[PDB]
Amino acid sequence: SIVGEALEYVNIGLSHFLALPLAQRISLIIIIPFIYNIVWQLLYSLRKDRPPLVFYWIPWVGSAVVYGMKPYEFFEECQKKYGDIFSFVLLGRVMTVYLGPKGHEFVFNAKLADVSAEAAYAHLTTPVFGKGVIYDCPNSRLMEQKKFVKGALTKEAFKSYVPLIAEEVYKYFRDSKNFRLNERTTGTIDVMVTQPEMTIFTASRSLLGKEMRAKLDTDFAYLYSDLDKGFTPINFVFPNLPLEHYRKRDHAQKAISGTYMSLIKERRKNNDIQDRDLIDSLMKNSTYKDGVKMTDQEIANLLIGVLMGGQHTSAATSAWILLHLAERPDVQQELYEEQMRVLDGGKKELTYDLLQEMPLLNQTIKETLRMHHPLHSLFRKVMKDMHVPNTSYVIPAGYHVLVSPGYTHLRDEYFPNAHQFNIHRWNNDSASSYSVGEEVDYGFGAISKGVSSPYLPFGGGRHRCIGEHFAYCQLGVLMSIFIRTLKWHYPEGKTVPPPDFTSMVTLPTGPAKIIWEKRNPEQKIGGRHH
Template sequence: MPGALPLVGHMLAFGKNPFEYMMKLRNSLGEIGEFRMFHQKMVLMTGPEANEAFFRAPDAQLDQSQAYKIMTPIFGKGVVFDAPPHKKDQQLKMLMPVLRDKPMRGYAEVIVREVEQMIAGWGDAGEIDLLAFMKALTIYTSSHCLLGDEFRYELNEEFAKIYHDLEKGVNPLAFVFPYLPLPVFRRRDKARARLQELVTGIIAKRAQKPEKSEDAFQLLIDARYDDGSRLSAHEITGMLIGTIFAGHHTTAGTASWTLLELARRPEVMRSVLNELDAHFGADGEVTFQSLRETPLLENVIKEVLRLHPPLIFLIRKVMRDFHFKGYTVRAGKYVCTSPRVSHRIADIFPDPEKFDPERYSDARQEDARPFSWIAFGGGKHKCSGNAFAMLQLKAIFSILLRRYTFELIDDKDTYQDDFTQMVVQPVSPCRVRYIKRLGMKKAAAETARNTAQAEAPVRPRFQIKIDRELCQGHATCMSEAPELFHVDDVGNVTVLQESPPLNLLAQARQAEKYCPTQAIKIELIENPEESKNGRIS
């Protein structure tokens, strides 16, 4: 890329607006191009083919850990990205049970209760800073679901302050100089040390209790490495921080943008309200299963994530020469991909700047091409918490939108992304006005009367295929179709029937639809004789 300056390279242009710079690079150089940040050479790859090469590359070639040393002072030495590959893999697997299907089914009730508590004092109308509200709400829901009652209730205010100081430590300067003696980094380090003190105290208290909790904290206390050793308080602290980082500030930004985009478009807001009113009525219970049956709300969230992905670029360090089409990226450079840029390729998403939730309808399926929609990443490194994030967002809006209507206070064009932050969120403050919905029961009853269910056609035969590289062992498939799938304690999936009967097709489709990593494919076979030649995985 032309325009590099002495010493800083393209850093000034990139830092001013990384999205605009990366769009300019793609428009100038195509799906692969190089730029420089200070002394470091960076290669940007965008588009489905480039994304697939990026996400499917083995760790020994494209190393995620080397690229995210920025998180070492926050997570801690020897934790996640700073751990050797075999140890990092074990640490990440220790957290998987809390994100698997069975515990997920209890989270909807917790999230709904938190939302109801947050809005209990709102009254008939008022104004809020939407981002500040969503940050508070998602830290409560994430900590309550994943970390347990102590963090949610006993350490409420102190934990929020600690988390704030840790979050501010994720500063672009830390990519190059993570230990400069700056006030923001000193507060980060002090917060990390204080949190470890608190974690050590809670571990001691829990050891005295006869009953055990079922949250991520307890999972880490009980976890063992392959050699039988326990996690230290230092490691538990770092992994708890990582758990909340993954499920909080990304979700807060997405939740804020979801409400902002709906408030900008009253017609889409009405459609979503009609769906929620028809499905839940005025007082219907919000559950794990009922939230799955709100496809329009889910499509709205997916479109928000297409236009406003919280992580606008993902980075890997090239450990061995990396080849893509006719290009070679030499070891020592960094490779990155950008969800925000890839999501605006007109050949895949026509009229890419338009907010259009119908892109994901059965008729259009614009995201069907593999590695085209990558808001949660892709391949074996796809965010393992993506199912929790979607559940959290849908549960929040199933309550908020049925209780209140929302309006923008400022001009709609003033609500913009803040590219000065590592995790992109709306510029704060982003003010909205809320007004209590009146006649909600009447509206719900009317919508229910006008809603009809269409039956899906049954096809003659089907077969099941699993992409073992994508599968992370969430066990959602086993919950949806226990007669077709079994997942063992370490996350290995077995398909139980090679020639499933037709009456299990609906269950198989549910397993395919709700697999968090889209590792399952159901292939329909018109001619039953074709199955004799097809390979059943």
């Protein structure tokens, strides 16, 4: 009755194992995890308390390639195979996707104790924005930072920003090599070149003020670019490894935050605190409820985070608006008639209040945000085992949850002919977003308690965007001026480009070129330039 001999042979086998030729050893160093991963999945598939897990061949990598390149196609296939809740492996992580409005509710309205945005995002955002702010702090601190920033984002602020943003757009038409409207009546433009510039110029001028806008006319502008390079998904996978673009990122965060602090300290020194810009607002309103004041460094870092939050979302959105309208001269025409009607043939200066009487313009923004949600996936890290109603699924701590309102934006069930750009689907519904009932306040103002709307370009729950009205103001002014000034169309044989999903936002695949032409070739934009 001897197993003893077999145990001897276990030991022997280990010894012969260690003595394998490097050919066999490398071979087995690959072959063991490969096999184990596979039997682990087959085993995993037997659990009834886990959502189905998308099958994958390469350990750790998982479905990263297909998810990374075509997330909506990936989701549609998974949704056909498994239904609305399913998991997939992504560079060492397990992501549980919950598609549709029930998913919106499951993730956006998740208990503070159940999930963490900062645990999913901080390793990426902290090196770019700086310490102490956004995701480098407890959620309660984030809630109050959002309150502080919202305090510079009032209707009175927007009334004052509208002419500043209009001035910037006109200067860009006058001065940018991309246009030069006083010298050229037609031209070709890459919207992924122009829109990020127009976006940072307009947002700098209004939120940060004249000094910081002036800085963007210099080599200082390059820092923003560098800062931008730290804000990509390789950093999402490697938050730090020793590469130059990381160092340029850190340097840029320091130099830019340094410039912000210099202005702030100069203002406090000269008692030159007004109500002009978000800087003046944070200088007056940045004490948390426990009485601790944000430091000047944290104020600057928060300024960087806020501007970054508006930068890629807004730039991508105006790129897509231009791109969709480039093949819809009927829509340009309709928007132009609205401009002439609301602004008395141009004899009225554009104001914030008049932007609110441009429903077609606002529906154009809304519809572009439907077809092109800038963020295809939003994440949380699961901190406590979560039960999914009405199921037997448990999402264990250590998993991530992924919600995709932009995928639902593109489903025929919620938006008939979802792949058709139709601003009129929003007729009698021009609002950037509508809370369809009860509200709740997480610390930065009353917002919709339910997050079941199939349309959620600005998310929902405690992490909801606070920049929505700024974005509509900025996009509104910008597009109002584009429409009143220019007609545009595609080069022959060109059409709307497919999205690039690999980037930080779902921007168009470039070069995405449009040809513009002046509606009034003889019109001059005044003011001095060199």
